[PDB]
Every structure is written in structure tokens, then in C-alpha cells.
Design an enzyme around this catalytic site. Structure first.
Site, mmCIF file in Angstrom:
data_model
loop_
_atom_site.group_PDB
_atom_site.id
_atom_site.type_symbol
_atom_site.label_atom_id
_atom_site.label_comp_id
_atom_site.label_asym_id
_atom_site.label_seq_id
_atom_site.Cartn_x
_atom_site.Cartn_y
_atom_site.Cartn_z
ATOM 1 N N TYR A 1 47.093 32.483 115.175
ATOM 2 C CA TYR A 1 45.894 31.774 114.762
ATOM 3 C C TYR A 1 46.334 30.379 114.366
ATOM 4 C CZ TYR A 1 44.112 36.577 113.958
ATOM 5 O OH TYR A 1 43.768 37.897 114.084
ATOM 6 N N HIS B 1 62.363 29.036 126.401
ATOM 7 C CA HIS B 1 61.713 30.275 125.946
ATOM 8 C C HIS B 1 62.595 31.564 125.994
ATOM 9 C CE1 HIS B 1 57.998 28.446 124.868
ATOM 10 N NE2 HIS B 1 57.777 27.959 126.076
#
Ligand SMILES: NC(=O)CC[C@H](N)C(=O)O
Ligand SMILES: [Zn+2]
Length: 746
Positions: free
Chosen positions: A516, A688
Site C-alpha cells: 500500500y 531484482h
């Protein structure tokens, strides 16, 4: 009585309950039964909230544990074989697709120009569409839940055309056009809709937001094909629902559909009303999206009601619904959670919970109920905002009048600049650099309470800076970074140091899965009161003789990753941000930080959804606001820019006139930059999650064939904030060792 309607409610919980329980489940602390229990509780809570508010048309199937698009993939059996080989129950197959399994996760993709991400539907030639009834049929079960509470809901499903069109062929089927699978998926939709009607659903919200895009004519024809197949007496009435844009170029596609009604976004595109209302047949309803579902401003009731009245004039009061413009997924849950905002500012806002009361007041207003107390209080709030000094800063307004071509052009074109930069830095061929961040809370926390000196905290930041700088020296990097340990996030760190921003304690919005964001809010005219980054860059430069990159977030990214103002254009806000950052750049350069990188990760994200004046205007002003930030410098100052894209518009990149660009890259697009003199660093490895000195020496020899070595910088794909030290060490060493071997033969 005109009905009120909400297109979806955020599901994260006013206290972030959903995050807590999903992460506890994924960690093994909580059982799946506990997770489902908490989801039921959240939905029940939200349905009651909307019922208490007075909302007439309340959604269901808007809830999700991860992503609603992903939920339909599951439901419809769009499940690639790789995720089925692990003995997982349906919900854990869902989580595997969404987040991988520790098989990588399905692709994450921006949902239009919102800040939400969905999980790309992924199809194969072998895909067999069918209702997964094993799990439960989520939309039937949640409708049934709400009904047992005494709440009749309208189920929300993404429609067939959008669901396919936004999807993609899996690796094994690179030649599949997703939209060709329409005939195979329609029966599965029809069945789902029959089951919803049987459960007692009288209306479904069927989302077709692809109508606000530029659609090929062959795709436009598929609405009639799909909706002819679905509508009938054995299914609920369908409300064909669009948002985020202008349907007008596609009206012919939906002008003769058998559906029960339509929803349009009259917040983003109020001017489309006359034309879209013109296609409505006798019997069809018009849902007027007039409470913004993607921003936080209290709605002007006088203005919103006028739009609704224009609609009533066209089709009758009986056939109009007052709606949110989109789902409220894109807004925080509840303004009453905010405990620090000054009440003056808070008066200008409405979060999800408050928007419920807004659609209700606007529906009462146009229905002729007495809501004069509420209208007057709303008119007060609106007037106070437009009159406030926060909103209009004369200094910034004057400074905006200095903007033009000249302010956005460097003193010399790149060729003369390169000469001066070569003299100053004498960087070797295949110069090595990185993008900024390297591999926290307690000292921050105790500094924030007064438990440690400003003096005490500055010491730990500096030790970490020192550690990082010595590291990069040790392994022979040519242009260094400070690592950014003092920074929490690349937008708030700036917004907290700019005038014209407000911050929430609890204004969380889902970005993807359980991640979020709490965006800053732009409340007013932006300016920069004092240096934002100078201290740490200067410190970092003082301990090495290598050039140190200054590090800034660009104006467009700050705008796009914030809740913007709705009273002034995007452009104006970005230009004010460009001016503020210009001052920062000037301060960095004056202090000896004469290599400065400006990161614009959000440029492509803000691209207008259709081709045309608005898009081309945006590319022009995006670039200009960057150039306003970066064009005041001396020729010998080296401006870098980083983009987290693999194929961002070469044209737009040239428009920035940056001395050096780094682009993610780990097809033939490197050729686009051949007769472009400025330097480029094509990212050599995905940060990543070591390549070898050979794997690098092959990658640079690969690139080096399509591109001049004299222009070529060597760096990773992005910052290494999200990595561990041991792989950073070996990976970068290899990278530099590789460059040196090339540096030797030129
Ligand atoms: N997302 C980005 O653009 C990364 C920028 C930042 N300087 C870093 O290295 O972390
Ligand atoms: Zn990046």
C-alpha cells in the site's frame, strides 16, 4: 427519487486489517480459515457502512485478497499449467500467480492511468475457459453473504472484451491474439450471470473500461457480439460501466447494445455528457459519475448536482443514477482517521467513507429532498479552499510567468558541453556507475522523539554514506553515489521539504497485493524553502575524489505519485515542481555537486489514455518541467536521468537533453540512438535478484555492435536498495572488471 451508487469500496480496512492478515497467512502465523474469517468481517463492515450511509446501489465482488482481475482469472480457469503442479488449494494457486511461489508471478501491470496494479490475464492456445466451482464462485458467495446481512448488492465483474483485451499470450503461445478467445469465454460469463440472477441479483455492474482507449475497429465490433450473447431474461440487468476517460470515439460500438444502462466518468470527462446521453435508448439508465474515485477532494455539490441535472434533462429523472466516477479503490478509507492535519485543510478533503455521504447528499438534492444544511456547509468548505493563501502563493504565480523555451534550454548544445565535461572529469571509456541506492529504523525513531541528537543521527547516516563510498572506490566505480540511506521513499522525502504539500497518518491506498502507498497530497502552490539534499551529497563528495552524483526525483514523478490538486492543471503543478527543483539543482551545483541525476520513473504512467492533443501536450510539458529543473547549470555540469522502462519513447528521452541517460535493458531499439550525440547507459543486469565477467563481456560486446563505445556507460538496471550485500559486491566487481577489459582495447 434518484438513486446513489458506489462502483467499489477499498478493501484494505480502515486499520490496514487486510494487509496484516494476508501477510500473517503468507508467513504461516495465520491459517487460511482465519484469513477467510477476516475477509468476511471486512466485507460485512464495508457493506454496513454503505447501507448506513444511505447508498442505494452497493457493490459486491469488489473485495479481493490480492487483485480483482486475478480473481476472475481464477474463477474462469485462466490458470497457466506451471501454477497447478504444487498441490495448492485454489486460493493458494491465486496467491502463487499473484506473488510467485518460494515459478515467478504473473506480470504486474498499471491499471490504466490509476496508481493501482492488476495481474495480467495470461492465456495459452490450450486455455480452456470454465467456471471454477471447486473454490466457491466468489461473486455468488459474496452476493449471498451480503443478502444474509439484509444488504442487496450489485455484483461487479470485469466484462469479456476488457478482460481479454487487457490480457496477454503466455510464453508458449506468442502468436495468440487474446480477443480471438471471445467465443470461448462468453458461455462462461453467461453461466456466471445465470447463477447470480438465481441467487437474486437483479443488476450487475459489468466494467468495460477499454472503451476509453483507442480501440481498433475489429475490437469495437465485439461489444455488440458479446452483449448480444449475454443479455436475456435469464440474467440480471447489465450496467455497462466505463471510467477514467472519454468513450466518444467508441460510441458507434455501444450505440446499439441490448444492455440495461451505462455508466460514464463525468469527473475526468464532463464534456462527453451530451454525446453519450444521445445514444441511450428508451428504457436505458445513465449512471453519472460525479464523485471522484481517484482523489481526495471534497466534492463541490453545486457543480456535481448541475452535471447530474444535465443528465436528468436528457433522459429523465427516473433513468439517472448519481455515482462515484470510478471504484473508490483508488482512495483512502476514512478521513476521520487523520489526527494531525489542521482542521482547515481537513475540511477540504473527503476520503472513501465520506464519498459515500456525498453521493447520497447529491442524490437527495436532485430528488428534491431538503439538504440545504449540507449544501451550505459544502459551499463554505469550497469557498474557504479557493480563498486560502495555501492555495495561491503570489511568489509562485509570478515565477510561473518566467517559464519558456529559454528557461528550458541549456547554455550550449551537447557537443560543446561534452568538450567541457571531458576537460573537467576526464572519465575513461566505459565509465562505470550505479543508479543510487544500496543495501534503518531505531535511530530514525529515537531522533523523531528527541532520544538522540540531530548530531547523533547525522553520525550514523554519515557512517553509512562512508561505508558505501569506500565500497564503490574499492571496486573501482568511476562515478559514485551516496546510497540514499537518509531517504524513506523517493516522493515523500521531497514533498515533506516543499511548501504546498499535506501528509496523512493513515491515507493508505492499495498499490498492488498487500503493498500500500500513502501518497502525499498537493494542496497548494509549491515552492522549496531551503536545501533538501545538499548536506548529504556534500558530505559524500567530501570523502572521495571520484565525482559524486546528486540525486533527485523529477517533477512529473512527484506529481504522479501524489494526490494532485483538482483546481489547477497537472501541467501547472509540474512546472511549479520544476521550478522548485531548479533551485535545488542550483544549490547542489554551487556547493560542488556538479554531477546530478534526476529520476523520472512515473513519466510513462501519466501518458494520456488516447492519442491526440492532450497526449502530445503532456509529453511536451513533462519534458519541459524536467528541463526547467535541469537547464540552469553550467556546461561542465553533467545531468543524468534515469528511467525504469525498457522501451520508453526514444523521442521523449532526446527531448530531456540529458548529458547521460540510464535505461533498464537486461530488441533493435539501441539503433534509435545512433546519431544522437548524448551518452547512454543500457542497464546490464536485473537488480531484482551474480553474472560473470564473461556474461557481462558478452552483454557489452552484444550491445557494442549496435552502438558507439564512445557513448556507452556501464551500470545495473536500477538502484540496489532491494538487494543483499554479498551479491552486490560480486555483481558490481564483475561489472567493473568487464569494463576495464574493454577499456584496455580502446
Ligand atoms: N526507482 C528509481 O528510479 C531508482 C532511483 C534511486 N536513485 C535508486 O537508485 O534507488
Ligand atoms: Zn530504475
Amino acid at each position: 427519487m434518484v438513486q446513489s451508487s458506489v462502483l467499489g469500496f477499498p478493501r484494505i480496512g480502515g486499520q490496514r486489517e487486510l494487509k496484516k492478515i494476508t501477510e500473517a497467512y503468507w508467513s504461516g502465523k495465520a491459517t487460511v480459515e482465519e484469513l477467510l474469517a477476516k475477509g468476511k468481517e471486512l466485507r460485512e463492515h464495508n457493506w454496513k457502512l454503505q447501507q448506513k450511509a444511505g447508498v442505494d446501489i452497493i457493490p459486491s465482488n469488489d473485495f479481493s485478497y490480492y487483485d480483482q482481475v486475478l480473481d476472475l482469472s481464477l474463477l474462469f480457469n485462466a490458470i497457466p499449467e506451471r501454477y497447478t503442479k504444487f498441490d495448492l488449494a485454489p486460493i493458494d494457486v491465486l496467491f502463487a500467480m499473484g506473488r510467485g511461489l518460494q515459478v515467478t508471478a504473473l506480470e504486474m501491470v498499471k491499471w490504466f492511468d490509476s496508481n493501482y496494479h492488476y495481474v495480467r490475464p495470461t492465456f495459452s492456445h490450450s486455455t480452456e475457459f470454465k467456471l471454477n466451482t471447486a473454490a466457491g464462485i466468489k461473486p455468488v458467495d459474496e452476493f449471498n453473504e451480503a443478502k444474509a446481512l439484509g444488504v442487496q448488492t450489485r455484483p461487479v465483474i470485469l466484462g469479456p472484451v476488457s478482460y481479454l483485451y487487457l490480457g496477454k499470450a503466455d510464453k508458449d503461445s506468442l502468436d495468440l491474439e487474446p480477443i480471438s478467445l471471445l467465443p470461448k469465454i462468453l458461455p462462461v460469463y453467461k453461466e456466471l450471470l445465470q447463477k447470480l440472477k438465481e441467487a437474486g441479483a437483479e443488476q450487475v455492474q459489468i466494467d468495460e473500461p477499454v472503451l476509453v482507449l483507442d480501440l481498433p475497429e475489429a475490437v469495437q465490433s465485439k461489444f455488440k457480439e458479446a452483449y448480444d450473447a449475454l443479455v436475456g431474461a435469464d440474467v440480471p440487468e447489465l450496467i455497462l460501466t466505463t471510467y477514467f476517460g472519454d468513450v466518444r470515439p467508441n460510441l458507434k460500438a455501444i450505440e446499439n447494445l441490448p444492455v440495461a444502462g451505462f455508466h460514464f466518468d463525468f469527473v475526468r470527462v464532463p464534456e462527453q455528457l451530451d454525446e453519450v446521453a444521445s445514444i441511450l435508448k428508451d428504457g436505458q439508465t445513465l449512471s453519472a459519475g460525479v464523485v471522484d474515485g481517484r482523489n481526495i477532494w471534497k466534492t463541490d455539490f453545486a457543480k456535481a448536482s448541475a452535471v447530474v441535472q444535465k443528465a436528468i434533462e436528457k433522459v429523465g429523472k427516473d433513468k439517472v443514477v448519481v455515482a462515484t466516477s470510478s471504484s473508490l479503490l483508488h482512495t483512502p478509507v476514512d478521513l476521520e482517521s487523520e489526527t494531525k492535519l489542521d482542521a482547515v485543510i481537513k475540511d477540504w478533503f473527503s476520503f472513501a467513507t465520506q464519498k459515500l455521504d456525498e453521493v447520497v447528499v447529491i442524490a437527495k438534492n436532485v430528488s428534491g429532498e431538503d439538504v440545504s444544511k449540507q449544501l451550505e456547509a459544502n459551499a463554505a468548505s469550497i469557498k474557504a479552499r479557493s480563498e486560502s493563501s495555501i492555495t495561491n502563493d503570489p511568489k509562485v504565480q509570478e515565477r510561473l510567468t518566467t517559464i519558456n523555451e529559454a528557461l528550458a534550454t541549456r547554455k550550449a548544445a551537447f557537443p560543446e558541453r561534452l568538450t567541457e565535461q571531458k576537460a573537467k572529469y576526464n572519465l575513461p571509456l566505459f565509465p562505470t556507475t550505479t543508479i543510487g541506492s544500496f543495501p534503518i529504523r531505531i535511530n530514525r525513531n529515537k531522533f523523531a522523539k528527541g532520544q538522540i541528537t540531530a548530531e547523533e543521527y547525522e553520525a550514523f547516516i554519515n557512517k553509512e554514506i562512508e561505508t558505501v563510498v569506500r565500497f564503490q572506490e574499492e571496486i573501482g566505480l568511476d562515478v559514485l553515489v551516496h546510497g540514499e540511506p537518509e531517504r524513506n521513499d523517493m516522493v515523500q522525502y521531497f514533498g515533506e521539504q516543499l511548501n504546498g504539500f499535506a501528509f496523512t497518518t493513515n491515507g493508505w491506498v492499495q498499490s498492488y497485493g498487500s503493498r500500500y502507498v500513502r501518497p502525499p497530497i498537493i494542496v497548494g502552490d509549491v515552492s522549496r524553502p531551503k536545501a533538501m539534499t545538499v548536506k548529504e551529497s556534500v558530505y559524500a563528495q567530501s570523502i572521495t575524489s571520484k565525482p559524486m552524483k546528486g540525486m533527485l526525483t523529477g517533477p512529473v514523478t512527484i506529481l504522479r505519485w501524489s494526490f494532485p490538486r483538482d483546481d489547477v492543471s497537472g501541467k501547472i503543478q509540474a512546472l511549479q515542481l520544476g521550478l522548485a527543483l531548479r533551485d535545488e539543482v542550483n544549490d547542489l551545483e554551487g556547493a560542488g555537486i556538479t554531477v546530478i541525476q534526476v529520476d523520472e520513473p512515473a513519466i510513462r504512467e501519466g501518458l494520456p489514455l488516447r492519442a491526440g492533443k492532450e497526449r502530445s501536450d503532456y509529453l511536451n510539458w513533462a519534458a519541459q518541467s524536467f528541463r526547467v529543473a535541469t537547464s540552469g547549470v553550467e556546461n561542465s555540469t553533467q545531468i543524468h536521468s534515469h528511467f525504469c522502462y525498457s522501451d520508453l519513447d526514444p523521442n521523449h528521452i532526446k527531448a530531456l537533453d540529458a548529458d547521460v541517460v540510464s535505461i533498464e535493458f537486461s530488441p533493435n531499439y539501441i539503433q534509435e540512438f545512433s546519431e544522437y550525440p548524448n551518452h547512454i547507459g543500457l542497464g546490464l543486469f536485473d537488480i531484482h535478484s551474480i553474472p560473470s565477467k564473461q556474461e557481462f563481456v558478452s552483454r557489452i560486446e552484444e550491445i557494442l555492435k549496435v552502438y558507439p563505445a564512445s557513448k556507452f556507460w556501464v551500470n545495473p538496471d536500477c538502484g540496489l536498495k532491494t538487494r543483499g550485500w554479498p551479491e552486490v559486491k560480486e555483481s558490481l566487481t564483475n561489472m567493473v572488471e568487464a569494463a576495464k577489459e574493454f577499456r584496455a582495447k580502446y
